[PDB]
Amino acid sequence: DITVYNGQAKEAATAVAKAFEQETGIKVTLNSGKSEQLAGQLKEEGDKTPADVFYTEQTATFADLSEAGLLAPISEQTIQQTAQKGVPLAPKKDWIALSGRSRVVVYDHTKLSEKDMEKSVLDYATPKWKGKIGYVSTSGAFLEQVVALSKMKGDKVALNWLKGLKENGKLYAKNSVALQAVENGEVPAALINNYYWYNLAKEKGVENLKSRLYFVRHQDPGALVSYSGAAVLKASKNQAEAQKFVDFLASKKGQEALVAARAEYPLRADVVSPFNLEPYEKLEAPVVSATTAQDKEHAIKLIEEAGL
Numbered sequence: 139d140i141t142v143y144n145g146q147a148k149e150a151a152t153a154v155a156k157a158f159e160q161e162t163g164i165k166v167t168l169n170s171g172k173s174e175q176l177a178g179q180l181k182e183e184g185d186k187t188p189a190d191v192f193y194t195e196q197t198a199t200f201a202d203l204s205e206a207g208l209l210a211p212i213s214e215q216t217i218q219q220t221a222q223k224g225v226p227l228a229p230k231k232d233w234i235a236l237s238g239r240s241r242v243v244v245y246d247h248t249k250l251s252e253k254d255m256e257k258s259v260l261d262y263a264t265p266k267w268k269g270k271i272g273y274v275s276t277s278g279a280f281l282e283q284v285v286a287l288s289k290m291k292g293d294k295v296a297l298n299w300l301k302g303l304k305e306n307g308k309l310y311a312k313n314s315v316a317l318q319a320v321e322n323g324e325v326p327a328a329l330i331n332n333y334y335w336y337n338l339a340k341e342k343g344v345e346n347l348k349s350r351l352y353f354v355r356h357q358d359p360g361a362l363v364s365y366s367g368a369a370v371l372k373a374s375k376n377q378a379e380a381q382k383f384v385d386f387l388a389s390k391k392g393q394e395a396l397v398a399a400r401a402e403y404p405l406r407a408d409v410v411s412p413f414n415l416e417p418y419e420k421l422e423a424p425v426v427s428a429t430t431a432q433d434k435e436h437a438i439k440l441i442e443e444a445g446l
């Protein structure tokens with residue numbers, strides 16, 4: 139049996155854990171928390187950690203652990219299972235990207251069509267969208283978007299975008315609130331994440347929704363995908379079962395368990411989500427370096443500088 143430090147949504151972690159125990163007979167104990175806190179605990183605990191695997195919603199959090207020599211190598215064959223073009227790879231082969239969530243524009247299709255949408259996420263923060271674009275400045279994925287903009291286009295462009303949203307956008311407290319605002323006709327469009335829309339669509343049925351999704355694609359900063367993944371702890375004295383779990387998460391069956399439980403994009407090419415997601419490859423996500431704590435501190439300063 140193994141212990142998994144879990145930073146991923148509980149529905150996902152519980153679903154893949156269950157499917158692992160059913161397929162192998164090996165029991166999984168999840169110890170759940172914030173990935174940043176969990177990684178900190180794994181560094182503090184060092185070679186005394188009871189964690190066998192670290193399952194996360196953000197592969198960027200592996201960087202420090204890899205740098206500290208705390209992660210074990212994974213099989214190159216396992217890594218290749220999810221190694222589609224654009225998917226982050228561990229240079230030391232000591233973690234694996236498993237799935238993704240995407241930035242998206244949700245819009246009221248009875249007020250706008252795709253003809254009204256922008257080819258760049260930058261263009262939603264302009265006077266054409268005054269009073270007509272929702273955004274969630276407090277959300278984690280919004281912060282990831284800002285980091286991506288700074289990296290891809292520099293600070294002036296990112297800051298200008300944030301100023302644009304301050305002047306032209308409508309602020310919402312949460313992604314779910316922004317989605318309901320579009321559904322209820324308060325705002326014709328909003329910047330959110332994909333899984334919110336697909337959850338609403340799976341629950342209520344798409345024929346009963348006013349809102350649809352527009353994907354900017356072509357490696358625009360607005361096509362940003364955030365990657366979930368797993369790693370085995372070097373300190374684990376149960377390498378065989380830890381590696382079996384990670385191998386399982388990258389297998390067809392493990393990916394199937396994940397996508398049934400949550401509307402993330404599988405990174406296997408041969409699995410299809412029952413949420414009716416398009417293939418990962420079609421998203422055309424940009425290639426962006428992992429978010430560091432420094433990246434985040436700096437994006438927070440841009441948000442403040444912009445009046446948000």
Ligand SMILES: [Fe+3]
Pocket residue numbers: 278
């Ligand atoms: Fe969240």
Ligand SMILES: [Fe+3]
Pocket residue numbers: 279331
């Ligand atoms: Fe989220």
Ligand SMILES: [Fe+3]
Pocket residue numbers: 313
């Ligand atoms: Fe959320």
